């Protein structure tokens, strides 16, 4: 029961629909996410389906859908510029919606920059209606009115030409749905971007335990989490801030060439098995010193919260914990998805805790910085 602001007169954002990436080699990118991250290739458009300008590979893990897109032709102006500016990265964060027309009319009236006005596509399995507007940077939002669409992903997509015996042979990673999608902004842009979500989409600010305590000194960022009225989609917005060390938000914006998605968090209900199986697929994660766990166990000595998972196993797998007196979450961060120090992924499991892990900024900073100081900062 919190201040959610005025209830929108019409329109609903049900959930994240899919995330679309603009990449240099969609075939190889799909292979990376299926083999390393537990996805399965679901659907495809390309030369073989009559799509002559764009190749599209759709991969799925439970409710999580990622789409990888590349150009077929030399000197594709739009995709080419994006690739050169940003490297591989997120282009579209798509939302499943009800009452598309109200949402789009309101967004347009309130100043949204339109990429494509309402359109529909159909095949043997039904019809889907869409619209696309710009958000921060070169990122966009497609609203997807799927009317319990019974086809393969979306109209026009076809089965992949081949099955993949490599991805098939690997163990399940148990990632269920997209928990949140974080967008990094350049200096001083967080408030105007958050205001866009409030005005254009009638989102509101989501207040969690992380908003109640300052972590700027360690995190070197400020964040505002924007969410739809029913709080089913969460869009954190970061900007750099003055802290004890150079801001990773500034590094992101420098190497991404502007604002963009920093991380996508994937919610799991069995993080130990998830991380064991992601590690078996060759994924790497932040290295966590043993002192983090020694200090965490000492802090937990005065807490009434009960950690259900085996702490020795969490320590072995370098899974992080954040808690208050009413619950806790588990989280872990992958290494970067590319050479540029830009996008990474997060795996998160919640036990009655609606925050984002901000306590770990201080906890990891203290454990890692102290050890490096002892090592002469060499």
What residues line the site for ligand A1L7D (CB under 6 A)? Answer: 180, 182, 210, 218-219, 223, 225, 236, 248, 333, 346, 356-358, 360-361, 364-365
Which residue carries 């994240």 as its tokens?
16
Closest CA to 360 of 303, 295, 272: 295
* Residue 139: DSSP 8-state: -
Q: Which of 101, 338, 350, 362 binds its own copies (CB under 8 A)?
A: 338
Residue 120 interacts, among Co ion, ligand A1L7D, its own copies, none and using kind-specific CB cut-offs from 5 to 8 Å, with: none
Output 328 or 356, the one with its CB closest to Co ion.
Answer: 356
The CB-of-132 to ligand A1L7D minimum distance in angstroms stands at: 25
What is the C-alpha to C-alpha distance for residues 291 and 214, in angstroms, rounded to an integer? 23
Pick 23 or 264: Cβ nearer ligand A1L7D? 264
Asked whether the CA dihedral 335, 367, 303, 182 is positive or negative, the reply is negative
Q: How far is 100 from 117, CA to CA, in rounded Å?
A: 11
For its own copies, the binding residues in 127-186 under the rule CB under 8 A are: 162, 164-167, 169-170
Among residues 93, 94, 265, 274, which is the contact residue for Co ion, using CB under 5 A?
A: 265
CA geometry: angle 120, 125, 130, nearest 5 deg? 20
- Of the pair 90, 154, the CB lying nearest Co ion is at 90
Please give the order of strands across the beta sheet that includes 12-22. Answer: 40-45, 54-61, 64-71, 12-22, 89-98, 140-146, 126-134, 114-123
Residue 244: closest CA among 360, 362, 376: 362
Residue 298 CB, shortest distance to ligand A1L7D, in Å, is 18
User: Is residue 235 close enough to count as binding Co ion by CB under 5 A?
Assistant: no
Q: Which does 140 bind (CB under 5 to 8 A by kind): Co ion, ligand A1L7D, its own copies, none?
A: none
Q: Which of residues 7-36 bind its own copies (CB under 8 A)?
A: 23-29, 31-32, 35-36
Q: How many CA atoms lie within 13 A of 321 on its CB side?
A: 26
Task: Give Cβ neighbours of residue 324 (< 8 Å, ≥ 6 apart).
Answer: 209, 305, 353, 355
CA distances from 226 to 2, 208, 220, 223, 326 (A): 14, 11, 20, 10, 23
First and final CA of the chain: distance in angstroms? 50
Per CB under 5 A, which region of 65-73, 239-247, 350-358, 366-374 contacts Co ion? 350-358
Q: How many of the other CB atoms lie within 10 Å of CB of 165?
A: 7
d(C-alpha 333, C-alpha 356), whole Å: 12
Is 353 annotated as a binding-site member?
A: no
Q: Name the residue nearer to its own copies (CB basis): 13 or 344.
A: 344
Minimum distance, C-beta of residue 213 to Co ion, in the bound complex (Å):
17
Which of these ranges, 129-137, 220-228, 273-281, 346-354, lies near Co ion under the rule CB under 5 A? 346-354
- Selected binder of its own copies within 339, 373, 376, 378 (CB under 8 A): 339
CA separation, residue 349 to residues 40, 174, 189, 275, 355 (Å): 22, 11, 30, 11, 11
Q: Check the annotation: does 180 bind a ligand.
A: yes
Question: Which of 115, 172, 195, 280 forms a contact with its own copies (CB under 8 A)?
Answer: 280
Q: Which residue ranges make up the site for its own copies (CB under 8 A)?
A: 23-29, 31-32, 35-36, 46-47, 55, 70-76, 80, 83-88, 162, 164-167, 169-170, 255-257, 279-282, 284, 336-341
Q: Which residue ranges make up the site for Co ion (CB under 5 A)?
A: 265, 346, 356
Binding site listing for Fe cation: 180, 263, 346
Binding site listing: 180, 263, 346
């Amino acid at each position: 029961y919190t201040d959610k602001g005025p209830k929108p007169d019409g329109g609903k954002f049900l959930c994240f629909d899919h995330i679309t990436f603009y990449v240099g080699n969609a075939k190889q990118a799909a292979s990376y996410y299926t083999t390393r991250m537990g996805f399965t290739e679901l659907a495809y458009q390309g030369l073989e389906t009559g799509s002559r300008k764009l190749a599209k590979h759709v991969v799925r893990q439970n409710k999580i859908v990622f789409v990888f897109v590349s150009a077929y032709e030399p000197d594709n102006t739009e995709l080419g510029a994006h690739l050169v500016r940003h490297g591989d990265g997120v282009k579209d964060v798509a939302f499943t919606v009800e009452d598309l027309d109200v949402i789009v009319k309101r967004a347009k009236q309130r100043g949204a920059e339109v990429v494509r006005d309402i359109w529909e596509e159909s095949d043997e399995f039904g019809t889907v209606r869409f619209a696309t507007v710009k958000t921060y940077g070169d990122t966009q939002h497609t609203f997807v009115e799927r009317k319990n669409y019974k086809g393969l992903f979306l109209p026009g997509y076809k089965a992949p030409l081949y099955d993949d015996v490599l991805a098939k042979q690997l163990p399940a990673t148990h990632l269920d749905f997209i928990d949140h999608v974080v967008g990094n902004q350049p200096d001083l842009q967080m408030e105007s971007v958050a205001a866009w979500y409030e005005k254009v989409l009638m989102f509101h600010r989501f207040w969690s335990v992380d908003d109640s305590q300052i972590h700027t000194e360690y995190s070197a960022l400020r964040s505002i989490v924007m969410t739809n009225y029913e709080e089913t989609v969460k869009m954190p917005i970061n900007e750099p801030a003055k802290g004890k060390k150079k801001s990773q938000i500034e590094e992101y914006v420098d190497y991404y060439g502007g604002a963009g998605v920093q991380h996508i968090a994937l919610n799991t209900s069995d993080i130990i098995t998830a991380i064991e199986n992601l590690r078996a697929r060759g994924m790497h994660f932040l290295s966590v010193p043993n002192t983090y766990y020694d200090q965490l166990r000492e802090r937990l000595k005065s807490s009434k919260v009960k950690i259900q998972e085996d702490m020795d196993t969490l320590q072995k797998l370098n899974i992080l914990i954040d808690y208050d007196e009413d619950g806790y979450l588990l989280q872990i961060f992958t290494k970067n998805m590319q050479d540029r120090p830009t996008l990474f992924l997060e795996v998160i499991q919640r036990h009655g805790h609606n925050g984002f892990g901000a306590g770990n900024f201080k906890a990891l900073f203290e454990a890692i910085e102290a050890d490096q100081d002892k090592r002469g900062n060499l």
